[PDB]
Amino acid sequence: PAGHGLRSRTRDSFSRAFRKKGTIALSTYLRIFKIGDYVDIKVNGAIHKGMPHKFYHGRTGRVWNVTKRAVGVEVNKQVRNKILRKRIHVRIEHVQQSRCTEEVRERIKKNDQLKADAKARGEVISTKRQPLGPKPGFMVEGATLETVTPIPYDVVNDLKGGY
Amino acid sequence: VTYKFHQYQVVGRALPSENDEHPKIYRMKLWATNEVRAKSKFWYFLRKLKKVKKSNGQMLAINEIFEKYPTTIKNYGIWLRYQSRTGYHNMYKEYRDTTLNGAVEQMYTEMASRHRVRHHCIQIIKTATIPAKLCKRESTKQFHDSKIKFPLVFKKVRPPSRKLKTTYKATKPNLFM
Amino acid sequence: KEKLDHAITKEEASAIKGASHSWYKTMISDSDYAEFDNFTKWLG
Amino acid sequence: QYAKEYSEQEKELIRLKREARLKGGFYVDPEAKLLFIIRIRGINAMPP
Amino acid sequence: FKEANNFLWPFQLKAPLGGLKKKRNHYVEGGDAGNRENFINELIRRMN
Amino acid sequence: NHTAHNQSYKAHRNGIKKPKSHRHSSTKGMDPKFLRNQRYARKHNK
RNA sequence: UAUUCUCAAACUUUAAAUAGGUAGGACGGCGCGGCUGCUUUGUUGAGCCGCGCCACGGAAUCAAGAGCUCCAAGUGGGCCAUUUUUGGUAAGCAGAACUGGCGAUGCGGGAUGAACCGGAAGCCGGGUUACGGUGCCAAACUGCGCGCUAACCUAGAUCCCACAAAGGGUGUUGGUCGAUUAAGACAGCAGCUGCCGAAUCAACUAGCCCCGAAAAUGGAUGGCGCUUAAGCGCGCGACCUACACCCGGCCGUCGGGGCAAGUGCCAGGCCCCGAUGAGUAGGAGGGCGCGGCGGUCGCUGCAAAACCUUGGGCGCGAGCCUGGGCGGAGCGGCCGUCGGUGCAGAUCUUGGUG
Ligand SMILES: [K+]
Ligand SMILES: [K+]
Ligand SMILES: [K+]
Ligand SMILES: [K+]
Ligand SMILES: [K+]
Ligand SMILES: [K+]
Ligand SMILES: [Mg+2]
Ligand SMILES: [Mg+2]
Ligand SMILES: [Mg+2]
Ligand SMILES: [Mg+2]
Ligand SMILES: [Mg+2]
Ligand SMILES: [Mg+2]
Ligand SMILES: [Mg+2]
Ligand SMILES: [Mg+2]
Ligand SMILES: [Mg+2]
Ligand SMILES: [Mg+2]
Ligand SMILES: [Mg+2]
Ligand SMILES: [Mg+2]
Ligand SMILES: [Mg+2]
Ligand SMILES: [Mg+2]
Ligand SMILES: [Mg+2]
Ligand SMILES: [Mg+2]
Ligand SMILES: [Mg+2]
Ligand SMILES: [Mg+2]
Ligand SMILES: [Mg+2]
Ligand SMILES: [Mg+2]
Ligand SMILES: [Mg+2]
Ligand SMILES: [Mg+2]
Ligand SMILES: [Mg+2]
Ligand SMILES: [Mg+2]
Ligand SMILES: [Mg+2]
Ligand SMILES: [Mg+2]
Ligand SMILES: [Mg+2]
Ligand SMILES: [Mg+2]
Ligand SMILES: [Mg+2]
């Protein structure tokens, strides 16, 4: 509306990948979606029903409802000075289960056991991750040294493969 | 005692990896005003010549090279590559100095004067101490004379210090060669 | 003022001097400039 | 105790560098753990 | 370190005694910006 | 005619404001069949 | 059929940089039970509920704190710049994208300038700098070094920026490639050749300079001038220079703390500690001033009001207090309350006067 249709500017976004057209593999229809799961919205161009607006393509949201053929997804949308919680329904052909939280569950268990193993011995520790820190000092065994020097200029070589 | 430009050997390598646990070690002889700038120019060449960026490289050693005999006079040849306003060129220059640091300082000063080439547009390819009989430039040959003799045609008239400076004097300077 | 007069073994001192001297030789070592076949004459 | 530790670290680094030199290898110094940062530009025309 | 460093109020240094070279260029180019490694100490003397 | 100049600056004066997140979210718009059964389940809960 | 030159905003297999979304716990996890009309062949699932147990805070950095609501002003002509970018030969032209800037904002530099560089500001002392500078104008070197340039065209002289091109020079300075030469080159001289006895020839390249280069008031590296530059390129040391930074004083604002068997206080006060200060349109607070009214405390013929003054003092300020003079009959402070309550402008009104 107001100068732009629903699918305006979707020539590339909503087109199928090269040599990946035709029948949709059935693993898409065997996925299980639960409330609270995170899903990435990826519009399939072949399915014209229950397809989200182009804005939600490439966005990750949280599942808040499950129907026969579609899942309700909560997606953040920035409008001026506010973030809106947009609730949309999308057919499962356009959603992929996201691996954004794949490390959380396995990390909690490791932290829980590490704290438990430390509680029994009365040693207070921290399970927090840390970013890459500075490396310690070390010795490197001597080896043959290859000398690098600037190369004399040659005009004939100022072209891919030369002139 | 003090030089504008210092010579350094910089040694570095690519970070060890599972495929290459002992990557090749590269060394360069670079000229810079201090160690920090010597390291930066070392990674410039390794990035563009060996495809090893500093982000995936390792600095091993950096040592400053000092003239062996800073009291004698040597002839220094410098092979360099520089960028003009229209392209790149190669040239060979000769200098006479007590240390190669002074000869390199002369080279940068000359390139700025005769070619308007700034420091960052010059790459030093090679340096060497040339024996007198193998020099090529006449500006260096004419001083290879056991009986070198000439007067001071141009003198600078001035008091030893500004303490003896006066605006007015009773007589003009008396100068003779 | 009184002109009052070693912490390394004599053999150790000789090894230290040799190692440092050898390291200095590598510091001033130059490339052979053999990979620049088109500029052999110019590079000398 | 702290004063003694500072002197030992300074001499420890010197010994390791000399040890690597004697064996013909290299000793990579530990990467700096601490930085001091100074602001050198004013507060005018700041990108967000 | 986090608590000890945050406990310190940011240091209010003075204008450097002797001035700067060029704040608009990187220290590698002969300016004053960026990492100058151990040479930050030389600047700390003139600004403290 | 049109321009977005200064609009991001205006938005960031008091924004970007994220909505308040509560432990329990509204059930409006969810499957009525699921909601109706849930209401009965709570009714007979003991 | 196998090759080949060159291409695409409305072509594309492939495919960046930058930017975009989500997640990194106490709203977590596990165990045992329960509810249902939904779901399953199935207490099978789904969600929820109860009880018990565990949960060192589950990347970094910061956090002058976070959330919520009400009422309302002004605004809805914009402009400039780096970069991306459309129309146009182009425009100090027109139109978009991200950010900053001006507008609303002084201050130092750019001679001069809304936007360029630096940098944002209470009132001061000291110190040090930013950009920019150190021959005079003009605070700081005719400082210490190397080279280049010589302009008989007004040589040249600093981001934006106030212009210059193709093409040329046996001007001069560097460099690159090649050729020739003590077995004698080159020029001249001599009859391919002899004398000749030391360097010579050719092309290319790029610094400065010169040609190319024509406009109307007399004129503009800002001016004067400058050539062992005071020009150009690159250095070194010192020095000069902001309302910027640092230390100190004082004012305001904001935040924090102390003060009762009260020797106890305009507590609406006193004292102590920390940070901080730009402002048009606009909002609000605390104050100043004018004329009444209800009260209260006073002044005045031993001189009220008004007015005059090169008298003096207080307050950041609106203003206030007071000396002297003139004048000759009224006037003021304080609390509350009220209003036809504050002028430099309106081709403002009336009167007066240059
Ligand atoms: K269109
Ligand atoms: K409006
Ligand atoms: K020329
Ligand atoms: K009264
Ligand atoms: K008076
Ligand atoms: K009143
Ligand atoms: Mg309409
Ligand atoms: Mg629109
Ligand atoms: Mg249909
Ligand atoms: Mg700026
Ligand atoms: Mg401060
Ligand atoms: Mg000083
Ligand atoms: Mg400066
Ligand atoms: Mg800038
Ligand atoms: Mg209007
Ligand atoms: Mg408009
Ligand atoms: Mg217009
Ligand atoms: Mg306006
Ligand atoms: Mg100007
Ligand atoms: Mg001052
Ligand atoms: Mg001079
Ligand atoms: Mg030309
Ligand atoms: Mg001037
Ligand atoms: Mg102060
Ligand atoms: Mg203010
Ligand atoms: Mg009154
Ligand atoms: Mg008067
Ligand atoms: Mg009064
Ligand atoms: Mg009235
Ligand atoms: Mg009125
Ligand atoms: Mg008037
Ligand atoms: Mg007015
Ligand atoms: Mg009038
Ligand atoms: Mg009139
Ligand atoms: Mg008249």
Residues in chain F: 46
Coil vs helix vs strand at B29: strand
Residue B34 in contact with partner chain C when CB distance is under 8 A = no
- DSSP per residue, A120-159: TTT-----------PPPPEEE---PEEE--PPPP-GGGSS
For residue B113, what are its two tokens?
A: 């004067």
Ligand 25: centre distance to CA E10 (Å): 26
Say what the resolution is, in angstroms.
2.3
Phi, psi torsion values for B36, nearest 5 degrees: -60, -45
Give, in order, the Cα–Cα distances in Å from C11 to each of C16, D12, D17, E38. 9, 23, 20, 36
- DSSP per residue, A76-113: EEEETTEEEEEEEEEEGGGEEE--TTHHHHHHHHHHHH
HEC profile for chain C? CCCCCCCCCHHHHHHHHHHHHHHHHHHHCCCCCCCCHHHHHHHC
Residue whose tokens read 């794949």: A102
Rg for chain E, CA atoms, rounded: 13
Closest CA to E41 of B36, D43, D7, B2: B36
B 73-92: CB under 8 A from C: 77, 79, 90, 92
Residues in chain A: 163
Q: A10 burial class (0-12, 13-18, 19+ CB within 10 angstroms)?
A: middle
For residue B58, what are its two tokens?
A: 């390792």
Residues in chain E: 48
Q: List, in sequence order, every residue forming a beta bridge with A41; answer none if it has no partner.
A: A95
Let me know: does A49 contact A40? Beta carbons within 8 Å.
no
Give, in order, the Cα–Cα distances in Å from D7 to each of A47, C7, C20, D3, D27. 73, 19, 25, 7, 20
Let me know: does A82 contact F15? Beta carbons within 8 Å.
yes
With a CB cutoff of 8 Å and minimum separation 6, the contacts of A23 are none
Phi, psi torsion values for B101, nearest 5 degrees: -60, -45
> What are the CB-based long-range contacts (under 8 Å, 24+) for E30-34?
E30/B33, E32/D40, E33/D40
Nearest-by-Cβ selection for C33 from B63, B90, B126:
B126
Degrees to nearest 5, angle at CA A36 with A10 and A6: 20
Coil vs helix vs strand at B8: strand
Q: How would you label B149-170 residue by residue, b for 16+ Cβ within 10 Å and e otherwise?
A: eeeeeeeeeeeeeeeeeeeeee
Give, in order, the Cα–Cα distances in Å from E32 to each of B71, E28, E45. 35, 8, 15
Q: Closest nt to F45 (CA→C1')? A: G35
Rg for chain A, CA atoms, rounded: 27
Q: Which nucleotides of G are covered by protein (CB under 7 A)?
A: 12-14, 20-25, 27-29, 34-39, 46-49, 54-63, 67-68, 78-80, 95-101, 117-120, 127-132, 142-148, 173-178, 205-208, 228, 232-236, 238-241, 244-247
DSSP H or E segment with residue D5: helix D2-23
Neighbours of B40 (CB within 10 A): 19
Report the alpha-carbon distance of residue F11 to residue F4 in Å, rounded. 11
Ligand 17: centre distance to CA A4 (Å): 29
- Residue A6 has what DSSP assignment? T
Q: List, in sequence order, every residue forming a beta bridge with E26; answer none if it has no partner.
A: E33
HEC profile for F2-44? CCCCCHHHHHHHHCCECCCCCCCCCCCCCCHHHHHHHHHHHHC
Report the alpha-carbon distance of residue B135 to residue B92 in Å, rounded. 11
Let me know: does B30 contact B63? Beta carbons within 8 Å.
no
Let me know: does B11 contact B60? Beta carbons within 8 Å.
yes
The amino acid at residue C19 is A
Neighbours of A17 (CB within 10 A): 7
Q: List, in sequence order, every residue forming a beta bridge with B6; answer none if it has no partner.
A: B32
Degrees to nearest 5, angle at CA D4 with D3 and D8: 120
For residue D44, what are its two tokens?
A: 């005018």
Report the alpha-carbon distance of residue B27 to residue C25 in Å, rounded. 13
Q: B11 burial class (0-12, 13-18, 19+ CB within 10 angstroms)?
A: buried
What is the maximum alpha-carbon separation in chain C? 66
> What are the CB-based long-range contacts (under 8 Å, 24+) for A153-157?
A153/B81, A153/B88, A153/B89, A153/B90, A154/C38, A155/B87, A155/B88
- DSSP per residue, E1-48: -HHHHHHSPPP-PPPPTT--S-TTSBGGGTSSBS--GGGHHHHHHHH-
Residues of C with CB under 8 A from a CB of A: 26, 29-31, 33, 36, 38-39, 42-43
Give, in order, the Cα–Cα distances in Å from F10 to each of B162, F2, F6. 63, 16, 6
Q: How would you label A101-127 residue by residue, b for 16+ Cβ within 10 Å and e otherwise?
A: eeeeeeeeeeeeeeeeeeeeeeeeeee
